[PDB]
Amino acid sequence: PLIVPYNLPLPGGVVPRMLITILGTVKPNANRIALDFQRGNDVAFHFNPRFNENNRRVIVCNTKLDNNWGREERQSVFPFESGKPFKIQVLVEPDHFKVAVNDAHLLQYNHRVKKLNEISKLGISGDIDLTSASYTMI
Ligand SMILES: OC[C@H]1O[C@@H](S[C@@H]2O[C@H](CO)[C@@H](O)[C@H](O)[C@H]2O)[C@H](O)[C@@H](n2cc(-c3ccc(F)cc3)nn2)[C@H]1O
Ligand SMILES: [Cl-]
Known part of the structure; x- marks a missing residue:
């Protein structure tokens, strides 16, 4: 439903209590996925499922x-x-x-990039059919 790679603007960056939701379907025989929360050219948080790293499935952040x-x-x-x-x-x-x-806690990633209000884009890449990408405040 959306074209991948997809860029989701995050206006004014991120802030605590902001919830980003990505819905999609993994392709058959997928190799990789990435979410990239970006501060300009910097990547504050790269979340990277790898389906075959030495025949193991691992998430690299x-x-x-x-x-x-x-x-x-x-x-x-x-x-x-x-x-x-x-x-x-x-x-x-x-x-x-x-x-x-899928509603189960997976991981936490401590903020290395601390100018949260400059993390103003989310890139979504890889071997998915992307249905939607959105945010809300909780
Ligand atoms: O650290 C993290 C980075 O890791 C490297 S690989 C790394 O290379 C080290 C030096 O050789 C080695 O020392 C480590 O063992 C090994 O993990 C990836 O290329 C990097 N990447 C992955 C992607 C990507 C693009 C589109 C997608 F849909 C999915 C993913 N774009 N960039 C990044 O994920
Ligand atoms: Cl990769």
């Missing part, structure tokens, strides 16, 4: 500053399944992004 990736954070809980519909919810909290998939 990181930050990109001045074109350099930092220290990866890895989660081996892997809630996505090729061919199936999913919901990703990203709740901005004071100290971290809090991510739930």
Whole structure:
């Protein structure tokens, strides 16, 4: 329903209590997905499901500053399944992004980029059919 890669503007950046919801379906035989919360060219929060990294499924999270990736954070809980519909919810909290998939808490990612009100775009990329991408305040 939406064209991938998709850019969702986040007007005025993010703020605690802001909830971002992504609905879509993973393609058959998917290889990768990425969500990129961006501050200009920097990536404040990269959330990257990998379906086949050495025959393991893993989510890699990181930050990109001045074109350099930092220290990866890895989660081996892997809630996505090729061919199936999913919901990703990203709740901005004071100290971290809090991510739930299909209504189950998955991970938290501490804020490395601290100018939250400059994290003004979300890019959505990879091997999905994207149904919708939106935000609200809770
Ligand atoms: O850190 C995180 C980054 O990781 C690297 S790979 C990394 O490379 C290190 C040096 O060789 C190595 O040391 C680490 O082991 C290994 O993980 C990815 O290319 C990076 N990426 C992934 C994507 C991407 C684009 C579109 C999509 F739909 C899905 C994903 N765009 N950029 C990024 O995910
Ligand atoms: Cl990747």
